[PDB]
Structure formats: C-alpha cells, structure tokens
Design an enzyme around this catalytic site. Sequence first.
Site, PDB file in Angstrom:
ATOM      1  N   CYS A   1      -0.100   3.818   2.966  1.00  0.00           N
ATOM      2  CA  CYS A   1       0.255   3.182   4.239  1.00  0.00           C
ATOM      3  C   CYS A   1       1.749   3.136   4.481  1.00  0.00           C
ATOM      4  O   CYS A   1       2.495   3.876   3.869  1.00  0.00           O
ATOM      5  CB  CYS A   1      -0.250   1.752   4.284  1.00  0.00           C
ATOM      6  SG  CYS A   1      -1.654   1.521   5.303  1.00  0.00           S
TER       7      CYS A   1
ATOM      8  N   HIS B   1       3.895 -18.962 -18.175  1.00  0.00           N
ATOM      9  CA  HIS B   1       5.258 -18.719 -17.763  1.00  0.00           C
ATOM     10  C   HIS B   1       6.163 -18.369 -18.907  1.00  0.00           C
ATOM     11  O   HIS B   1       5.973 -18.816 -20.034  1.00  0.00           O
ATOM     12  CB  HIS B   1       5.846 -19.878 -16.997  1.00  0.00           C
ATOM     13  CG  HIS B   1       6.838 -19.439 -15.987  1.00  0.00           C
ATOM     14  ND1 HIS B   1       6.474 -18.764 -14.845  1.00  0.00           N
ATOM     15  CD2 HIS B   1       8.187 -19.524 -15.959  1.00  0.00           C
ATOM     16  CE1 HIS B   1       7.555 -18.479 -14.138  1.00  0.00           C
ATOM     17  NE2 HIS B   1       8.610 -18.927 -14.794  1.00  0.00           N
TER      18      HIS B   1
ATOM     19  N   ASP C   1      16.374 -18.085 -16.008  1.00  0.00           N
ATOM     20  CA  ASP C   1      15.126 -17.512 -15.530  1.00  0.00           C
ATOM     21  C   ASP C   1      15.485 -16.535 -14.440  1.00  0.00           C
ATOM     22  O   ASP C   1      16.173 -16.898 -13.498  1.00  0.00           O
ATOM     23  CB  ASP C   1      14.195 -18.604 -15.002  1.00  0.00           C
ATOM     24  CG  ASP C   1      12.847 -18.062 -14.553  1.00  0.00           C
ATOM     25  OD1 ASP C   1      12.686 -16.827 -14.518  1.00  0.00           O
ATOM     26  OD2 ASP C   1      11.937 -18.868 -14.239  1.00  0.00           O
TER      27      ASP C   1
ATOM     28  N   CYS D   1       0.881  -1.145   0.000  1.00  0.00           N
ATOM     29  CA  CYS D   1       0.000   0.000   0.000  1.00  0.00           C
ATOM     30  C   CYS D   1       0.909   1.181   0.000  1.00  0.00           C
ATOM     31  O   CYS D   1       1.799   1.267   0.853  1.00  0.00           O
ATOM     32  CB  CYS D   1      -0.880   0.045   1.241  1.00  0.00           C
ATOM     33  SG  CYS D   1      -1.844   1.583   1.384  1.00  0.00           S
TER      34      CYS D   1
ATOM     35  N   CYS E   1      -6.670  -1.148   0.560  1.00  0.00           N
ATOM     36  CA  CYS E   1      -5.847  -1.226   1.738  1.00  0.00           C
ATOM     37  C   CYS E   1      -6.735  -1.203   2.962  1.00  0.00           C
ATOM     38  O   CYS E   1      -7.279  -0.169   3.329  1.00  0.00           O
ATOM     39  CB  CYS E   1      -4.881  -0.045   1.766  1.00  0.00           C
ATOM     40  SG  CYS E   1      -3.974   0.121   3.297  1.00  0.00           S
TER      41      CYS E   1
ATOM     42  N   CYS F   1      -5.854   1.637   5.763  1.00  0.00           N
ATOM     43  CA  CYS F   1      -6.058   3.072   5.516  1.00  0.00           C
ATOM     44  C   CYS F   1      -7.296   3.355   4.684  1.00  0.00           C
ATOM     45  O   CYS F   1      -7.754   4.484   4.623  1.00  0.00           O
ATOM     46  CB  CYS F   1      -4.830   3.716   4.867  1.00  0.00           C
ATOM     47  SG  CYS F   1      -4.641   3.407   3.095  1.00  0.00           S
TER      48      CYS F   1
ATOM     49  N   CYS G   1       6.109 -12.292 -12.836  1.00  0.00           N
ATOM     50  CA  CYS G   1       6.926 -13.012 -13.759  1.00  0.00           C
ATOM     51  C   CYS G   1       6.974 -12.306 -15.110  1.00  0.00           C
ATOM     52  O   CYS G   1       8.040 -12.112 -15.691  1.00  0.00           O
ATOM     53  CB  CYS G   1       6.362 -14.419 -13.885  1.00  0.00           C
ATOM     54  SG  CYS G   1       6.482 -15.065 -15.547  1.00  0.00           S
TER      55      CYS G   1
ATOM     56  N   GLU H   1      13.239 -17.172 -10.581  1.00  0.00           N
ATOM     57  CA  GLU H   1      14.110 -18.022  -9.839  1.00  0.00           C
ATOM     58  C   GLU H   1      15.398 -17.468 -10.355  1.00  0.00           C
ATOM     59  O   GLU H   1      15.493 -17.109 -11.525  1.00  0.00           O
ATOM     60  CB  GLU H   1      13.915 -19.460 -10.260  1.00  0.00           C
ATOM     61  CG  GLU H   1      12.453 -19.831 -10.359  1.00  0.00           C
ATOM     62  CD  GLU H   1      11.673 -19.508  -9.077  1.00  0.00           C
ATOM     63  OE1 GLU H   1      11.982 -20.141  -8.035  1.00  0.00           O
ATOM     64  OE2 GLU H   1      10.754 -18.634  -9.112  1.00  0.00           O
TER      65      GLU H   1
HETATM   66  O1  LIG Z   1      16.005 -19.329  -4.928  1.00  0.00           O
HETATM   67  C1  LIG Z   1      17.027 -18.764  -5.761  1.00  0.00           C
HETATM   68  C2  LIG Z   1      17.749 -19.826  -6.596  1.00  0.00           C
HETATM   69  O2  LIG Z   1      18.261 -20.912  -5.796  1.00  0.00           O
HETATM   70  C3  LIG Z   1      18.166 -22.174  -6.504  1.00  0.00           C
HETATM   71  C4  LIG Z   1      19.573 -22.779  -6.660  1.00  0.00           C
HETATM   72  O3  LIG Z   1      20.532 -21.844  -7.176  1.00  0.00           O
HETATM   73  O4  LIG Z   1      17.359 -23.145  -5.783  1.00  0.00           O
HETATM   74  C5  LIG Z   1      16.160 -22.689  -5.109  1.00  0.00           C
HETATM   75  O5  LIG Z   1      14.985 -22.791  -5.952  1.00  0.00           O
HETATM   76  C6  LIG Z   1      14.395 -24.088  -6.179  1.00  0.00           C
HETATM   77  C7  LIG Z   1      13.107 -23.968  -7.000  1.00  0.00           C
HETATM   78  O6  LIG Z   1      13.302 -23.134  -8.148  1.00  0.00           O
HETATM   79  C8  LIG Z   1      14.118 -24.781  -4.845  1.00  0.00           C
HETATM   80  O7  LIG Z   1      13.630 -26.108  -5.087  1.00  0.00           O
HETATM   81  C9  LIG Z   1      15.375 -24.805  -3.967  1.00  0.00           C
HETATM   82  O8  LIG Z   1      15.053 -25.379  -2.694  1.00  0.00           O
HETATM   83  C10 LIG Z   1      15.939 -23.393  -3.765  1.00  0.00           C
HETATM   84  O9  LIG Z   1      17.162 -23.408  -3.015  1.00  0.00           O
HETATM   85  C11 LIG Z   1      17.553 -21.822  -7.874  1.00  0.00           C
HETATM   86  O10 LIG Z   1      16.625 -22.793  -8.382  1.00  0.00           O
HETATM   87  C12 LIG Z   1      16.865 -20.488  -7.646  1.00  0.00           C
HETATM   88  O11 LIG Z   1      16.786 -19.745  -8.856  1.00  0.00           O
HETATM   89  O1  LIG Z   2       4.672 -21.980  -8.493  1.00  0.00           O
HETATM   90  C1  LIG Z   2       3.924 -21.335  -9.552  1.00  0.00           C
HETATM   91  C2  LIG Z   2       4.133 -19.816  -9.533  1.00  0.00           C
HETATM   92  O2  LIG Z   2       4.790 -19.399  -8.327  1.00  0.00           O
HETATM   93  C3  LIG Z   2       5.563 -18.191  -8.558  1.00  0.00           C
HETATM   94  C4  LIG Z   2       4.775 -16.943  -8.102  1.00  0.00           C
HETATM   95  O3  LIG Z   2       3.666 -17.256  -7.235  1.00  0.00           O
HETATM   96  O4  LIG Z   2       6.827 -18.238  -7.892  1.00  0.00           O
HETATM   97  C5  LIG Z   2       6.719 -18.189  -6.465  1.00  0.00           C
HETATM   98  O5  LIG Z   2       6.362 -19.497  -5.942  1.00  0.00           O
HETATM   99  C6  LIG Z   2       7.291 -20.533  -6.295  1.00  0.00           C
HETATM  100  C7  LIG Z   2       6.749 -21.901  -5.881  1.00  0.00           C
HETATM  101  O6  LIG Z   2       6.347 -22.593  -7.071  1.00  0.00           O
HETATM  102  C8  LIG Z   2       8.667 -20.147  -5.716  1.00  0.00           C
HETATM  103  O7  LIG Z   2       9.625 -21.190  -5.977  1.00  0.00           O
HETATM  104  C9  LIG Z   2       9.101 -18.758  -6.278  1.00  0.00           C
HETATM  105  O8  LIG Z   2      10.405 -18.302  -5.876  1.00  0.00           O
HETATM  106  C10 LIG Z   2       8.059 -17.685  -5.932  1.00  0.00           C
HETATM  107  O9  LIG Z   2       8.391 -16.403  -6.499  1.00  0.00           O
HETATM  108  C11 LIG Z   2       5.853 -18.147 -10.057  1.00  0.00           C
HETATM  109  O10 LIG Z   2       7.255 -18.325 -10.321  1.00  0.00           O
HETATM  110  C12 LIG Z   2       4.988 -19.239 -10.676  1.00  0.00           C
HETATM  111  O11 LIG Z   2       4.181 -18.626 -11.691  1.00  0.00           O
HETATM  112 ZN   LIG Z   3      -2.810   2.083   3.438  1.00  0.00          ZN
END
Ligand SMILES: OC[C@H]1O[C@@](CO)(O[C@H]2O[C@H](CO)[C@@H](O)[C@H](O)[C@H]2O)[C@@H](O)[C@@H]1O
Ligand SMILES: OC[C@H]1O[C@@](CO)(O[C@H]2O[C@H](CO)[C@@H](O)[C@H](O)[C@H]2O)[C@@H](O)[C@@H]1O
Ligand SMILES: [Zn+2]
EC number: 3.5.1.52
Lengths: 320, 57
Positions: A125, A211, A228, A122, A158, A161, A184, A231
Amino acid sequence: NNIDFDSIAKMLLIKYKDFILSKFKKAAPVENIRFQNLVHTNQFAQGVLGQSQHLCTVYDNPSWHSIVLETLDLDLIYKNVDKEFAKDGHAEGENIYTDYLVKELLRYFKQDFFKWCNKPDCNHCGQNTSENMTPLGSQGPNGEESKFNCGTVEIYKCNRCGNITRFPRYNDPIKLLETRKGRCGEWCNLFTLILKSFGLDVRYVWNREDHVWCEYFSNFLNRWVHVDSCEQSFDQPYIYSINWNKKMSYCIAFGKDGVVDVSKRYILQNELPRDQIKEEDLKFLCQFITKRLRYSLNDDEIYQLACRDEQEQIELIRGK
Amino acid sequence: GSIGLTVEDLLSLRQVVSGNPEALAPLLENISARYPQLREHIMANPEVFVSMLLEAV
Ligand SMILES: OC[C@H]1O[C@@](CO)(O[C@H]2O[C@H](CO)[C@@H](O)[C@H](O)[C@H]2O)[C@@H](O)[C@@H]1O
Ligand SMILES: OC[C@H]1O[C@@](CO)(O[C@H]2O[C@H](CO)[C@@H](O)[C@H](O)[C@H]2O)[C@@H](O)[C@@H]1O
Ligand SMILES: [Zn+2]
Ligand SMILES: OC[C@H]1O[C@@](CO)(O[C@H]2O[C@H](CO)[C@@H](O)[C@H](O)[C@H]2O)[C@@H](O)[C@@H]1O
C-alpha cells in the site's frame, strides 16, 4: 582517653579491602553446589541465569561495535554534542561531556534513527498506513528471517489492498539496523549496543512485566542512570512506577560486569508480590553470577568494582 | 551483645569505607562519641572493633 581514630581507620580500610578481595577471590565448591541445584529448583532463577548468559556478554563484539559506528551518523551526533556542551557545560570542567553524548544519542535515536512499529505499515500500500491493518495472528519465522534472530513474526492483513505485511520480531541488533522499526523490545536491544559501541558502561535492565530499558553509568554523577530510548528519557527511574503507574514485581540489570537487582530503584510504589524465589536466594544468585563473571579481572579492577557495588547498594537501600 | 550498631550508622559507615575512605576516621570517631559501650571496646580492643563491621556487609 583520647583514642586514635586515624590509625584505627587506616587499619580498617585495609582489613576491608582484604575481606572484599576474598569474596571475589576463589571458586567456593560449597556454593557451586547450592547454585547448581537452586538453578534447577526455581526457574525464575534460571530466568536470570539465561539472561545473564546472553545479555552479559553478547554486546561486546567489536565486529558489531564497528558496523554500528559505520552506519550511525557520528558527524551529526558529535556536531550536536559539542553544540550543547559549549552551551553551558554544567558544573565543573568535567565528565559531563559523556552525558550530553548519551543524552544526544537519545534524541538521535528517536527523532531520527529508529521508527516505532505498532502495526506495521502496509508495504504494498501507501507509506503512512498503520490504521487499516487487522492482525491476523503470529507464526514461526519464514527462513529468510531465521537467518536473523527471530522466533515470531506477527502477520497483518491490509484492508485496503488485501495483502499480508509481515512484522518479524528480530533479536539480531544488526538486522535491526536494516529494518529501522520496532517496539520496545528491539528498541532497547539495539540502543543498548549503540551505547556499548561508544564503549560506555551499560546494563540492560529487564522488568518482569514486559519492559526493558538500559542503565548507563555516568562518571560525572557517578551512579547508574536510567536511560530509556523509547521514551527519549535521560534520568527518570520513576516514570514507569509513577507516571505510568506500572505494576512492577522485579527489575534486574545485566551488564558485562554484574547482574544486580535494581528493583528498589524503580518499583517505588505499585509494588507487586515478589516471589519466584526466596528474597535472599536472589541476592545469592546475582552475587554468584557476578563473581563468576569476574574471575578474569586483576586485583583493583576487582575491588574498585566491589566498591561501586556497595556504593549503589547503599543508594538503593537508602532510596534517596 | 554483638555490635549493637544503628541501621542508619552502620549503613552510613559502609558507605564511606566504600566511597570516601578519606573521612572514615571522623565518622569512626563521632560514631564513638555516641555509643558509650563502644567507646569501651575501642579503648580495650581496636581490632575487635574492626571485626563486627565488615562482618555486617
Ligand atoms: O516524549 C519524549 C520525552 O519527553 C519527556 C521529557 O523529556 O516527557 C514526555 O514523556 C512523559 C511520559 O514518559 C509524559 O508524561 C510527558 O508529558 C512528555 O512530555 C520524557 O519523559 C520523554 O522520554
Ligand atoms: O503504556 C504502556 C506501553 O505503552 C507503550 C507502547 O504502547 O508506549 C506508548 O504509550 C505510552 C503511554 O503509556 C507513551 O507514553 C509512549 O511514548 C508510547 O510509545 C510502551 O512504552 C509501553 O509498553
Ligand atoms: Zn496495502
Ligand atoms: O519483549 C520481549 C520479547 O520480544 C522478543 C520477540 O519475541 O524479542 C525482543 O526482546 C528481546 C529480549 O527478550 C530483545 O533483545 C529483542 O531485540 C526484541 O526483539 C522476545 O525475545 C521476547 O519474548
């Protein structure tokens, strides 16, 4: 006998480099018709065509390339890449540097540059205030926000507020340079350019089931690499299909040099029904777009790429 | 009939042609060591060997 291979080899190579240079020679008028019409028969075809038309260029605005180069902190980035390069420096005295670059750009974007937006904080806020916001809905862009490329604003109320905070979903990566937030969608978009701006080879890969991420071509490993930014992942094409257990149907990549189906690289389990298109109408599609995308290039550029093409085709279908 | 080449080889082949031209011969060789009926058509027509190859791309 004792047949001479060396000569039969050489002779082939040539006759090959020829046939190749003919594939990507000429506009065939017989195809042009089939393409044209298939685009109107199936829309998923249209889908990729539209995407090709946008993605496949768009990020090549040295205009943009500059702005990003200005606004990013290169001092800090390279400082780090050198720090890590000097650390080991993998195998041979080699192109391995540019990897460490991307790899770094990766962390920089995450633990530093861009912030993730689930529900917007927010504004009126406090600062750190996602939790207590209830999604009212979504609507058209205000007007100050059609000034950037935006079809939809999500609106949030929010509960502390009683004030609306808007979270418009922008496609202009430069605007994304001002807001540093995004899910994403924008997360990828920007970062795709941030890479292009260091002028690496980059595709923007689109998965049908909501995605996107990008591929970058490494000369060290010389193949594409799944990157990516969300991640902060360097090379892990599996991630989605296995760790996440995503249900995937299609993966296409669009880069200024080609549109190529990269499904086999990712959808390696939890495979969906593949059909808004005859499986080889798709093949045709890409090849056509890429051909058309390449009329410019000279006669090595053109072959040298058609090679990296096969080289990949055979990494996919091999599935190594 | 046609070529009669193993899915695996044929892949393999068009891999080096595209990514390792410096080794096309010794592949192109052993790939003959292995297909009697082809040892034939090399000895007769080197050319017509070539054809059915790129052909399959
Ligand atoms: O979260 C940032 C980055 O860490 C990595 C390893 O470099 O692993 C993480 O993400 C995985 C899912 O995408 C998880 O299963 C794992 O436990 C977590 O440490 C990368 O995958 C990620 O980009
Ligand atoms: O998992 C699908 C969806 O999750 C997103 C955003 O909600 O990523 C989040 O959740 C993941 C678990 O799947 C985490 O590993 C990630 O770091 C977190 O940002 C998207 O990446 C995806 O569309
Ligand atoms: Zn607010
Ligand atoms: O997830 C795709 C979805 O997000 C939108 C917002 O409406 O914009 C995002 O996705 C684009 C590609 O489709 C990105 O280039 C852009 O940066 C990002 O904001 C829509 O375009 C799309 O429906």
